[PDB]
Amino acid sequence: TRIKKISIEGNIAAGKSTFVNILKQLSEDWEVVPEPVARWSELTMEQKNGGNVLQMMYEKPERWSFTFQTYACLSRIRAQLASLNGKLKDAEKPVLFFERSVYSDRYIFASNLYESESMNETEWTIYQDWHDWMNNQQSLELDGIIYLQATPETCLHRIYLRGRNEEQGIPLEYLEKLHYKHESWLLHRTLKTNFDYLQEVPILTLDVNEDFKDKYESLVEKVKEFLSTL
Amino acid sequence: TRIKKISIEGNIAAGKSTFVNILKQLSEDWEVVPEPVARWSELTMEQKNGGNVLQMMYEKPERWSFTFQTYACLSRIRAQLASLNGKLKDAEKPVLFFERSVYSDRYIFASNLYESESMNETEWTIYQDWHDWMNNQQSLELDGIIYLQATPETCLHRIYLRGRNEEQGIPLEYLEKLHYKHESWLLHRTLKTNFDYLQEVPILTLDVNEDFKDKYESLVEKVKEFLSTL
Ligand SMILES: CCCN(c1nc(-c2nc(N)cc(N)n2)cs1)c1cc(-c2ccc(S(=O)(=O)N3CCN(C)CC3)nc2)ccc1C
Ligand SMILES: CCCN(c1nc(-c2nc(N)cc(N)n2)cs1)c1cc(-c2ccc(S(=O)(=O)N3CCN(C)CC3)nc2)ccc1C
Numbered sequence A, B: 001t002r003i004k005k006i007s008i009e010g011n012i013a014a015g016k017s018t019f020v021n022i023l024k025q026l027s028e029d030w031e032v033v034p035e036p037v038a039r040w041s042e043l044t045m046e047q048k049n050g051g052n053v054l055q056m057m058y059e060k061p062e063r064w065s066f067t068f069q070t071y072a073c074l075s076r077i078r079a080q081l082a083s084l085n086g087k088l089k090d091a092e093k094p095v096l097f098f099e100r101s102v103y104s105d106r107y108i109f110a111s112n113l114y115e116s117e118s119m120n121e122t123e124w125t126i127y128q129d130w131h132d133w134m135n136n137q138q139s140l141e142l143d144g145i146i147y148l149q150a151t152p153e154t155c156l157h158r159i160y161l162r163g164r165n166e167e168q169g170i171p172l173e174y175l176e177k178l179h180y181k182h183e184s185w186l187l188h189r190t191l192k193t194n195f196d197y198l199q200e201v202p203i204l205t206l207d208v209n210e211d212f213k214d215k216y217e218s219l220v221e222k223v224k225e226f227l228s229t230l
């Protein structure tokens, strides 16, 4: 019938890609939209652009943050809309799991870059104006959020496990800042956003500090119970 | 009934703002969408952002070209859509004159900045991808184009008449480059674009080298004849 839209949120290396790849296999009624930035980490024009932008970002974040954030968010909206229009047309209970959302783009990542002076006030105000508009010009509004909650230390350890050379420099302090933002948005619900409906969207919080790759049935049971409430 | 969309195109200081302000007064069925960049040259968030971006552009175009071009084009689409949805609902023969278009944004200005190395290949490819997408996600497609054709020398003289301090440094060579692009697009129709319908859109070319402020009736007669053909 109508596709349920669920975003999977969480810190760097919390296990979102891992969890989403588990979910996709469990039901023909379940599909996933992987995060464009994750895929930037035969190549399409977007992958070539995104690999160049990520590389330049590691080199000079105060030059590239606005360009990166705008392209990442555009790429996400395009990919989410393509799945929403493309998939699950013959499903009985269709669910589309988004790996992160246009809200994590703005309120986690772009916000953090502005706070670190990697965007100036004009870049940040243009970005928010563009986001406010790019989102209204609607069908991507979330039915629920699944928060994969891990400690900064767990996420630092999982960056090490994943082994991308570019990321081994990421310090615990950066992960603690992103952790606080997620806790403010999704646990305390203190974060004010420009999207009124978000204060009321249901949120399922899953503790993923314990390795779940071979032992995920309890997490999936909580996902199925949560889905039945929507 | 259905609003006719006509873009007014031409080099810097050819007399577009002048012509559009003449047209708006002549018919209750005629409305105009002034160019956001022109208005950046009580202040809204967009005017504050746009004044800052223009100022930084004069200082360092190779840092600010991508940010400026994206914001100018967004601002234009927003303003054109607002007029298309807002105005001329009780008109018998409604016409909306756009001061320039999303096509002059990309194929005149952004293209020129890429050619001058003020955008690198990644910035230019991201911009074109964004434009290709930002335009499809449709109701702004043009019914006709009015080309206000002036020599670079006329336009250089009219920059002097207009007297904006920031512009007095603009050299003839820059105006000659923008002139060639307009002639390729609108006179020879040699310019290849990613918008197939544009090769076939009617174009009215008006020679505006002679001052028309007190003597514009022949130009308006050619506009009314052109409109009757659409
Ligand atoms: C794996 C993280 C990749 N990463 C980023 N990703 C995103 C992102 N944005 C989305 N919209 C979606 C999405 N999925 N991802 C935004 S930025 C990234 C981060 C840093 C970076 C390094 C170091 C510190 S810091 O805290 O040590 N510090 C340094 C000194 N000074 C400036 C203050 C801050 N901060 C950020 C540099 C490059 C990059 C690509
Ligand atoms: C009145 C023109 C304002 N102007 C511009 N406007 C637009 C624009 N874009 C739209 N999408 C819509 C729209 N309405 N306008 C784009 S750029 C602008 C132009 C220059 C500038 C100066 C000098 C030379 S140059 O040829 O002398 N040369 C210098 C050495 N080196 C780099 C090679 C080039 N080129 C550009 C610098 C700032 C600015 C704001």
Ligand SMILES: O=c1ccn([C@@H]2O[C@H](COP(=O)(O)OP(=O)(O)O)[C@@H](O)[C@H]2O)c(=O)[nH]1
Residues within 6 Å of the ligand: A010, A011, A012, A013, A014, A015, A016, A017, A018, A019, A158, A159, A161, A162, A163, A210, A211, A212, A213
């Ligand atoms: O229960 C888990 C969850 C994740 N990982 C590993 O932790 C790293 C990061 O996970 P992922 O890529 O899923 O994190 P994301 O950034 O997508 O949240 C990867 O090497 C995973 O194989 C793990 O070993 N056990």
Ligand SMILES: O=c1ccn([C@@H]2O[C@H](COP(=O)(O)OP(=O)(O)O)[C@@H](O)[C@H]2O)c(=O)[nH]1
Residues within 6 Å of the ligand: B010, B011, B012, B013, B014, B015, B016, B017, B018, B019, B158, B159, B161, B162, B163, B210, B211, B212, B213
């Ligand atoms: O027939 C004309 C057309 C224009 N102008 C002057 O030329 C300058 C630039 O015109 P406009 O602002 O209309 O140019 P645009 O950049 O909008 O094409 C202004 O000072 C106008 O008053 C003029 O004196 N006579």
Ligand code: NA
Residues within 6 Å of the ligand: A023, A024, A025, A026, A027, A028, A029, A030, A031
């Ligand atoms: Na599936």
Ligand code: NA
Residues within 6 Å of the ligand: B023, B024, B025, B026, B027, B028, B029, B030, B031
């Ligand atoms: Na009018």
